[PDB]
Amino acid sequence: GALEEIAQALEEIAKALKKIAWALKKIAQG
Amino acid sequence: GALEEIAQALEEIAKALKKIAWALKKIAQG
Amino acid sequence: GALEEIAQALEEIAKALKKIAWALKKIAQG
Amino acid sequence: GALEEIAQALEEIAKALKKIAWALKKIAQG
Amino acid sequence: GALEEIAQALEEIAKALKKIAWALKKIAQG
Amino acid sequence: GALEEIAQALEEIAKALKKIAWALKKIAQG
């Protein structure tokens, strides 16, 4: 579906952003 | 410090994007 | 419903981001 | 200016999330 | 129309994340 | 260092989010 493809892409963006956020936390703490 | 705050904000933003994706899926399912 | 529940969560994230924004302004100012 | 720039960006994201929440309620209400 | 408002809000979030990326680069290269 | 990598990744996330928003706008338009 059209909106399902948009949502899938958004979910991948969000998972990538969560990883970046964790990496930045660890750099910050260190 | 500031970078740890920024990391938390990126995590909040990722959470919002994931929820927006689920909202789009529910809209499609309607 | 499902979309209204997401809307509430997004409003809470928005408040969290505004709190972090003020924390960053405080760090910059001080 | 870096931290203040990020704070301003987070505030704009917060506004955008409130806009999305409002749109979701409008969709939900039909 | 509400879905278009959601898309416009996502565009604003993307611009704001670009500004956050730019600010973090400035901190990194400082 | 790491923060430069994080900023570049965030810029890539923002570019992708812009494309997602544009696709959603076109869906919303018909």
Numbering used by the authors:
A (entry chain D), B (entry chain F), C (entry chain C), D (entry chain B), E (entry chain E), F (entry chain A): 1 to 30
Share the article's original sentences.
Here we describe efficient routes starting from validated parallel and antiparallel peptide assemblies to design two families of α-helical barrel proteins with central channels that bind small molecules. For targets with antiparallel helices, short loops are sufficient.
Our designs focused on the g-a-d-e sites of the classical coiled-coil heptad sequence repeat gabcdef, as these sites contribute most to the helix–helix interfaces. Specifically, we investigated 20 sequence combinations in which g = Ala, Gly, Leu, Met or Ser, and a and d = Ile or Leu. We solved high-resolution X-ray crystal structures of three peptides using ab initio phasing.
